[PDB]
Design a protein around this ligand. Structure first.
Ligand SMILES: *[C@@H]1O[C@H](CO)[C@@H](O[C@@H]2O[C@H](CO)[C@@H](O)[C@H](O)[C@H]2NC(C)=O)[C@H](O)[C@H]1NC(C)=O
Ligand SMILES: *[C@@H]1O[C@H](CO)[C@@H](O)[C@H](O)[C@H]1NC(C)=O
Lengths: 126, 122
């Protein structure tokens, strides 16, 4: 069984659709990060704002590491270290149909949120 | 942001004011691609806590905590003149409400610390 499955003893609903209640729980929260984190980082990154009007959130910001290496104390690239992305799974809502027939469906989006500086690994399988 | 979830006023009323949530997760087959042991190989390493809530989808939400205030140098030592700082992302999860046949779902905002980065202090 899955999370969205209603108990088997319950009467069936036409279309197999579920009730989505109004309002987003804890909507008032906002991300709090160090000022200019993406630029002050030794593994700096750039952002790409992706837009979809039939997706909630409509704007999904994607990060991309600026360099292969990490930035040293002198402000130069160090290729002995690697800037690597941090990717996280998220849920967005896809808006379907139109007007009175509007329905919603969950969608999994992989978001690259930022980069970190790692010591490289020599992989056993290339 | 309510408008995305609304219908024109003239639409036939749905008792309970609930919206239609269709079955299935779009692009559920996707898997996170990240460097192996990223959290401990990072110069701003972090710990993970697997938060669990059986009324939440996904039930498991992994939260990161920076292991140090400073960053780790080539020698494996902490340099407290650099800062390990958390990277935070806004996500949506689904909360299950009520019991039995009266079960409904509600969106919920969750702030996720995904890892840490090393920054030069200001
Ligand atoms: C990160 O996690 C480690 C555990 O892997 C924590 O280190 C342990 O902390 C507990 C605290 O109860 C101690 O009893 C252990 O002896 C510690 N073990 C090691 C190997 O250090 C550590 O506290 C965590 N770091 C932060 C900053 O939360
Ligand atoms: C982002 O990329 C551009 C090139 O498209 C580059 O000029 C810039 O320095 C990068 N970083 C920031 C913070 O804009």
């Amino acid at each position: 069984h899955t999370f969205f499955q209603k108990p088997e003893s319950c009467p069936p609903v036409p279309g197999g659709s579920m009730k989505l209640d109004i309002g987003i729980i804890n909507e008032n929260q906002r991300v709090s990060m160090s000022r200019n984190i993406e630029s002050r980082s030794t593994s700096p990154w750039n952002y790409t704002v992706t837009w979809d009007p039939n997706r909630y959130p409509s704007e999904v910001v994607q990060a991309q590491c600026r360099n292969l290496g990490c930035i040293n104390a002198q402000g130069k690239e160090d290729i002995s270290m690697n800037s690597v992305p941090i990717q996280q799974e998220t849920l967005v809502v896809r808006r379907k149909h139109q007007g009175c027939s509007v329905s919603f469906q969950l969608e999994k989006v992989l978001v690259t949120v930022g980069c970190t500086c790692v010591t490289p690994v020599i992989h056993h399988v290339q």
